[PDB]
Design a protein around this ligand. Structure first.
Ligand code: HEM
Ligand SMILES: N[C@@H](Cc1c[nH]c2ccccc12)C(=O)O
Length: 398
């Protein structure tokens, strides 16, 4: 518990992969004092961790009370009420009722619709770059924008309410006091309940939110108050840096791998594999958290009940045991769907197919219009490994 580890250090964020690979061979499970947690680096251990019912997702407190040390919250506090009433931070059986209660947004029919919507939104965004522009900053120009367009057109966040929502989510997601974070989370609840009453903006028809709103008369195993808590989670997830990071990191991968641009243009199987290879290549959420509900042993280490674990999805995704030549961006890779960037099992990302559709249709539009993308200077990363995202991606278009 006293052995130094570089895993919480912003210095590794530009390229964490060699650090992960070095430490994995030596100390695949080890203590990271700045995370107050056991790091778990290998694919096999992360996948087992995500499936292990000895590891609870009820971890909101452990993980906040880390970020704002000695800052003990009264109960009734909204963070506790929220975490206890959303899928992300609950265990079965309640988790499962919570997840079923949002199914209407995510049916097979719904995704057939979102496929069409996202094709068009991505096409239109890329088309709005003038053909003769020679350079862009792909982060603000594209990766920041497509998730917002998706939030409006596929999820049904009213356009007119983005000024309310995005800055609040950005404040929540900051790498700003505990009080402020609870204020913004309170505001997201107020917004969610008012949105469903018709007091905020207009929800577009056939969107995720319209479907969830139409499902409310039929609740059987969850409450109206839990719908409000879960919609506050959805807003955070929608405007989190996760989707921008996926879009930008994958754009960088294509810019540095012209041969894969060629493969994408040549072969529909490579197009179909693009979202998963992009997701594997750089997990936006490079680690997720668990608490040990019972003692477990992983990587030779006895982890005691109550201790926190950080499951390094980003490391897992570049484990050569699972992915031969893991550091190659390879659209021909046969098992890219085994990545852990959306988790696995009980908590696997609710939006996984929505996100893969967004990614696919973005790269279809981008590489058809601007096959010659290349970096125009060194990319600049952020400093937060947990939600890792490019800050700037200067790109030459031709
Ligand atoms: C590239 C973008 C995204 C990435 C990389 C991502 C990643 C993840 C990961 C890693 C998990 C599992 C967490 C764990 O097991 O601890 C997860 C869960 C979840 N994601 Fe996403 N996500 C993204 C976008 C979104 C969006 C836009 C939404 C909006 C609905 C969303 C909603 C959720 C929800 C609700 C859960 C919890 C599901 C449950 O607990 O049953 N995600 N996501
Ligand atoms: N990894 C986060 C959960 C998470 C996954 N995807 C997200 C998107 C936004 C916010 C949180 C998340 C946690 O352990 O707390």
């Amino acid at each position: 518990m006293t052995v130094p580890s570089p895993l919480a250090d912003p210095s590794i964020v530009p390229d964490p992969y060699p650090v992960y690979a070095d430490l994995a061979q030596r100390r695949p499970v080890h203590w990271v004092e700045r995370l107050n947690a056991w790091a778990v680096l290998t694919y096999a251990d992360c996948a087992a961790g995500l499936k292990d019912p000895r590891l609870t997702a009820d971890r909101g407190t452990e993980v906040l009370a880390a970020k704002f040390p000695g800052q003990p919250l009264p109960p009734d506090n909204i963070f506790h009420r929220w975490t206890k009433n959303v899928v992300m931070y609950t265990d079965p059986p309640l988790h499962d009722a919570l997840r079923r209660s949002v199914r209407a947004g995510f049916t097979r029919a719904a995704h057939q619709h979102y496929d069409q919507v996202l094709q068009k939104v991505a096409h239109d965004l890329v088309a709005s770059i003038p053909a003769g522009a020679t350079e862009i900053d792909a982060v603000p120009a594209l990766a920041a924008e497509l998730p917002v367009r998706s939030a409006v057109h596929a999820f049904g966040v009213p356009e007119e309410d983005l000024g309310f929502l995005i800055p609040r989510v950005n404040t929540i997601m900051t790498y700003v006091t505990q009080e402020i974070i609870l204020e913004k989370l309170t505001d997201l609840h107020t917004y969610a309940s008012e949105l469903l009453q018709g007091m905020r903006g207009k929800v577009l028809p056939d969107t995720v939110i319209a479907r969830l709103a139409a499902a409310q008369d039929g609740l059987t195993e969850t409450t109206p108050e839990q719908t409000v808590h879960q919609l506050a989670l959805v807003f955070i997830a929608l405007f989190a840096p996760t989707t921008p990071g996926s879009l930008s990191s994958g754009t960088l991968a294509f810019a540095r791998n012209p041969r894969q641009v060629e493969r994408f243009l040549a072969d529909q199987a490579c197009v179909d594999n693009t979202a998963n290879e992009v997701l594997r290549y750089n997990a936006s959420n490079q680690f997720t958290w668990r608490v040990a509900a019972k003692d477990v042993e992983m990587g030779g280490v006895r982890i005691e009940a109550g201790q926190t674990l950080a499951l390094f999805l980003g490391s897992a995704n570049r484990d050569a045991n699972m992915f031969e030549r893991p550091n190659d961006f390879d659209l021909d890779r046969p098992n890219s769907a085994r990545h852990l960037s959306f988790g696995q099992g009980v908590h696997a990302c609710l939006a996984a197919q929505l996100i893969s559709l967004q990614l696919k249709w973005f790269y279809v539009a981008l590489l058809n219009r601007f096959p010659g993308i290349r970096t125009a200077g060194e990319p600049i990363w952020n400093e937060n490994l947990e939600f890792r995202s490019l800050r700037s991606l200067p790109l030459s278009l031709r």
